[PDB]
Scaffold this active site. Structure first.
Site, PDB file in Angstrom:
ATOM      1  N   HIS A 130      31.998  34.912  74.753  1.00 42.81           N
ATOM      2  CA  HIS A 130      31.014  35.081  73.681  1.00 42.81           C
ATOM      3  C   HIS A 130      29.603  35.407  74.195  1.00 42.81           C
ATOM      4  O   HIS A 130      28.710  35.494  73.339  1.00 42.81           O
ATOM      5  CB  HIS A 130      31.000  33.846  72.767  1.00 42.81           C
ATOM      6  CG  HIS A 130      30.419  32.614  73.389  1.00 42.81           C
ATOM      7  ND1 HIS A 130      31.135  31.441  73.508  1.00 42.81           N
ATOM      8  CD2 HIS A 130      29.190  32.357  73.903  1.00 42.81           C
ATOM      9  CE1 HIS A 130      30.380  30.520  74.089  1.00 42.81           C
ATOM     10  NE2 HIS A 130      29.197  31.051  74.340  1.00 42.81           N
ATOM     11  N   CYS A 183      26.706  26.434  77.784  1.00 40.98           N
ATOM     12  CA  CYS A 183      27.939  27.212  77.884  1.00 40.98           C
ATOM     13  C   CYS A 183      28.151  27.750  79.284  1.00 40.98           C
ATOM     14  O   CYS A 183      27.204  28.158  79.954  1.00 40.98           O
ATOM     15  CB  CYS A 183      27.927  28.366  76.889  1.00 40.98           C
ATOM     16  SG  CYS A 183      28.161  27.720  75.245  1.00 40.98           S
ATOM     17  N   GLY A 189      22.493  26.347  75.617  1.00 37.18           N
ATOM     18  CA  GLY A 189      22.351  26.874  76.967  1.00 37.18           C
ATOM     19  C   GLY A 189      23.362  26.353  77.977  1.00 37.18           C
ATOM     20  O   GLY A 189      23.418  26.869  79.101  1.00 37.18           O
TER      21      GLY A 189
HETATM   22  C1  LIG Z   1      26.717  28.017  74.233  1.00 36.74           C
HETATM   23  O1  LIG Z   1      26.923  29.342  73.697  1.00 36.74           O
HETATM   24  C2  LIG Z   1      25.470  28.098  75.020  1.00 36.74           C
HETATM   25  O2  LIG Z   1      25.142  27.143  75.688  1.00 36.74           O
HETATM   26  N1  LIG Z   1      24.871  29.280  74.903  1.00 36.74           N
HETATM   27  C3  LIG Z   1      23.532  29.582  75.354  1.00 36.74           C
HETATM   28  C4  LIG Z   1      22.877  30.763  74.634  1.00 36.74           C
HETATM   29  C5  LIG Z   1      22.576  30.524  73.154  1.00 36.74           C
HETATM   30  C6  LIG Z   1      23.787  30.781  72.252  1.00 36.74           C
HETATM   31  C7  LIG Z   1      24.831  31.727  72.856  1.00 36.74           C
HETATM   32  C8  LIG Z   1      26.039  31.886  71.956  1.00 36.74           C
HETATM   33  C9  LIG Z   1      26.663  26.954  73.143  1.00 36.74           C
HETATM   34  C10 LIG Z   1      26.726  25.480  73.587  1.00 36.74           C
HETATM   35  C11 LIG Z   1      26.574  24.561  72.365  1.00 36.74           C
HETATM   36  C12 LIG Z   1      25.152  24.516  71.824  1.00 36.74           C
HETATM   37  C13 LIG Z   1      24.929  23.064  71.377  1.00 36.74           C
HETATM   38  N2  LIG Z   1      25.979  22.314  72.040  1.00 36.74           N
HETATM   39  C14 LIG Z   1      26.860  23.103  72.646  1.00 36.74           C
HETATM   40  O3  LIG Z   1      27.789  22.724  73.334  1.00 36.74           O
HETATM   41  N3  LIG Z   1      27.839  27.261  72.361  1.00 36.74           N
HETATM   42  C15 LIG Z   1      27.639  27.827  71.187  1.00 36.74           C
HETATM   43  O4  LIG Z   1      26.516  28.036  70.766  1.00 36.74           O
HETATM   44  C16 LIG Z   1      28.855  28.156  70.381  1.00 36.74           C
HETATM   45  C17 LIG Z   1      29.083  29.665  70.348  1.00 36.74           C
HETATM   46  C18 LIG Z   1      28.831  30.132  68.922  1.00 36.74           C
HETATM   47  C19 LIG Z   1      28.398  28.900  68.122  1.00 36.74           C
HETATM   48  N4  LIG Z   1      28.566  27.765  69.019  1.00 36.74           N
HETATM   49  C20 LIG Z   1      28.513  26.470  68.753  1.00 36.74           C
HETATM   50  O5  LIG Z   1      28.765  25.639  69.613  1.00 36.74           O
HETATM   51  C21 LIG Z   1      28.184  26.085  67.346  1.00 36.74           C
HETATM   52  N5  LIG Z   1      29.283  25.291  66.846  1.00 36.74           N
HETATM   53  C22 LIG Z   1      30.099  25.806  65.927  1.00 36.74           C
HETATM   54  O6  LIG Z   1      29.758  26.820  65.326  1.00 36.74           O
HETATM   55  N6  LIG Z   1      31.248  25.161  65.705  1.00 36.74           N
HETATM   56  C23 LIG Z   1      32.328  25.555  64.793  1.00 36.74           C
HETATM   57  C24 LIG Z   1      32.771  26.997  65.019  1.00 36.74           C
HETATM   58  C25 LIG Z   1      33.524  24.641  65.025  1.00 36.74           C
HETATM   59  C26 LIG Z   1      31.884  25.397  63.347  1.00 36.74           C
HETATM   60  C27 LIG Z   1      26.832  25.366  67.222  1.00 36.74           C
HETATM   61  C28 LIG Z   1      26.510  25.209  65.740  1.00 36.74           C
HETATM   62  C29 LIG Z   1      26.856  23.974  67.843  1.00 36.74           C
HETATM   63  C30 LIG Z   1      25.745  26.204  67.885  1.00 36.74           C
HETATM   64  C31 LIG Z   1      30.261  30.113  69.485  1.00 36.74           C
HETATM   65  C32 LIG Z   1      31.217  29.134  68.792  1.00 36.74           C
HETATM   66  C33 LIG Z   1      30.801  31.537  69.661  1.00 36.74           C
END
Ligand SMILES: *[C@](O)(C(=O)NCCCCCC)[C@H](C[C@@H]1CCNC1=O)NC(=O)[C@@H]1[C@@H]2[C@H](CN1C(=O)[C@@H](NC(=O)NC(C)(C)C)C(C)(C)C)C2(C)C
Ligand SMILES: *[C@](O)(C(=O)NCCCCCC)[C@H](C[C@@H]1CCNC1=O)NC(=O)[C@@H]1[C@@H]2[C@H](CN1C(=O)[C@@H](NC(=O)NC(C)(C)C)C(C)(C)C)C2(C)C
EC number: 3.4.19.12
Lengths: 306, 306
Positions: free
Chosen positions: B41, B145, B143
């Site tokens: 992603h 991920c 951040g």
């Molecule tokens: C992860 O992408 C990250 O650390 N990215 C850094 C850059 C900013 C966003 C890039 C996509 C991040 C880690 C999350 C953030 C808070 N706690 C974490 O573990 N993951 C995500 O942001 C993922 C990513 C997009 C949404 N998301 C989420 O974790 C969502 N959660 C959901 O949407 N969950 C359901 C699908 C089950 C409803 C939140 C709302 C927590 C941001 C994807 C799922 C593709």
């Protein structure tokens, strides 16, 4: 979100661990530049062990008596000196993996990471606090002496603890990296007991703020308390006194959550008086006191190290 | 003695963490030999984000769209491919710090260390279990991920987890290093819920053995139980079934303490039925289930890594 007992990444310290062998004793040493630091009781034997005079014992030693083993590479000792209860072995080679570092003597209540080691090889990393009675509740087996505790601050490793011994209650005692014991302990087998411990009040409050930041909201109440009235309750439950300085330190967390420090004290008061009644906070059924206010901010805001 | 939630030393993994930036998205990657692994992603944007087709999205990408930042050194991508939900970026430089490693897909109940990272820089290390419902109770901010979970076995890093997302209950979901999610989750914002979790029975028993090894003796009793009768009680308290295989795995700990596995089950039964009545075990007022039988043996016998 989430909240875990988090240790600092240990790589900077892993590259400094060596094995020190003298006589029939083997333990860990810390190799920084061209010096290896280790507990001075490496110069002890099975009978020196009850009341040794380390000054006499060390004058009788030669450099070649010290086996320093850095992986599969032997380090030659070219000098030695004693500083309080640590031995400093000068070696002919500077550790190329030496990080930026400082030696710091911490206050009770402060936390640090411990890299547990045996025979110069790291076994695991975990987070500890220096208890108010200057012990730590570690995990240490025979051979772990010379393992160190540390914090990391951006790029700098602040070493604060080196392991020496276990007390009959299963808790641990050691020194700063300049060889000064924390607490009244001595590196001698004579009767020694930890002394009554107390709970680190400012840390419990930090951890309640961590809980609020993470969505546990349930222990809050409408009440407030004065510092005086709070400290009268804390003393009854064997909690450290909360000082105005502690209140100031909790300022940022109070501002981020919108919960005045004294309001959080009123919550802690009711938790002490009523217990938790089968509920948990951050996955614990006890009031946790090994997170400092800084630990909470670091973990809830994502500070890194480079 | 002592017993702590111990993580593996993180240095071998610290040397593999990099920053991957594509578009407005920045996250962590894992650099092993000449490949950087990261969540697919990263090729998503603020609106791709609800129902993306990653195959379409990736065909539209060019190598030069991927900023891989290894400290203050930029890595040039020379190829990319998708494997399930991970992206593999071929770079022109092999990581000289690449440890001996394997990719392993773990079973629920197994534990691992997580190196939490932001912008390619490690923030902390902590121990997790894969819950029976294939979530982990981590500590992850925006951040994080691409942070990975791992075990170390003598000299070999077994990577088992890469972080992708947070579920509305504050728990975390991710993949193995081959990009297969643990559990039913998908890297798509659609409604998803963890599913009912259960307690890892074999791990609770291991931790009770740890307690006995360390001198907590108080929860033991004269009784025994059959596996059947035990499992009937476990089901009532939402505990995983204990299998004869679990009993066999607990053999070494049972032999070391002299407490038959089924005798320890009778103790767990009474703890479930009576609670702990204001007592603690290994500093916990809850029954702990994130230590495997192997974790206990490792920590109580001092296994190192070289
Ligand atoms: C992860 O992408 C990250 O650390 N990215 C850094 C850059 C900013 C966003 C890039 C996509 C991040 C880690 C999350 C953030 C808070 N706690 C974490 O573990 N993951 C995500 O942001 C993922 C990513 C997009 C949404 N998301 C989420 O974790 C969502 N959660 C959901 O949407 N969950 C359901 C699908 C089950 C409803 C939140 C709302 C927590 C941001 C994807 C799922 C593709
Ligand atoms: C430490 O020396 C070590 O790891 N050494 C490896 C080589 C074998 C022995 C060399 C001296 C070891 C760590 C201990 C072991 C178990 N848990 C630990 O943390 N320290 C010691 O062995 C120290 C050392 C000698 C005894 N000792 C102890 O820790 C004693 N404890 C006490 O004697 N405590 C009182 C003095 C308070 C009574 C035990 C009994 C635990 C071995 C000295 C204190 C010089």
């Amino acid at each position: 979100s989430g909240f875990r007992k988090m240790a600092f990444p240990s790589g900077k310290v892993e590259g400094c661990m060596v094995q020190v062998t003298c006589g029939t004793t083997t333990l860990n040493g810390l190799w920084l530049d061209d010096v290896v630091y280790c507990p001075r009781h490496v110069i002890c034997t099975s009978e020196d062990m009850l009341n040794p005079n380390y000054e006499d014992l060390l004058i009788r030693k030669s450099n070649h008596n010290f086996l320093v083993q850095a992986g599969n590479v032997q380090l030659r000792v070219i000098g030695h000196s004693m500083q309080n209860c640590v031995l400093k072995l000068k070696v002919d080679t500077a550790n190329p993996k030496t990080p930026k570092y400082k030696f710091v003597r911490i206050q009770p209540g402060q936390t640090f990471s411990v890299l547990a080691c045996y025979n110069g090889s790291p076994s695991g990393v975990y987070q500890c606090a220096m208890r108010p009675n200057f012990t730590i509740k570690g995990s240490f087996l025979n051979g772990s002496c010379g393992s160190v505790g540390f914090n990391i601050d951006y790029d700098c490793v602040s070493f604060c603890y080196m392991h020496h011994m276990e007390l009959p209650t299963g808790v641990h005692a050691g020194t700063d990296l300049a060889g000064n014991f924390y607490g009244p302990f001595v590196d001698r087998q004579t009767a020694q007991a930890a002394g009554t411990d107390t709970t680190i009040t400012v840390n419990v409050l930090a951890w309640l703020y961590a809980a609020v930041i993470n969505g546990d909201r349930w222990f809050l109440n409408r009440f407030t308390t004065t510092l005086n009235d709070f400290n009268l309750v804390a003393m009854k439950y064997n909690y450290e006194p909360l000082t105005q300085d502690h209140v100031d330190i909790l300022g940022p967390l109070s501002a981020q959550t919108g919960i005045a420090v004294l309001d959080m004290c009123a919550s802690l008061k009711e938790l002490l008086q009523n217990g938790m009644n089968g509920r948990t906070i951050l996955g614990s059924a006890l009031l946790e006191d090994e997170f400092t206010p800084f630990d909470v901010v670091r973990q809830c805001s994502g500070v890194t190290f480079q």
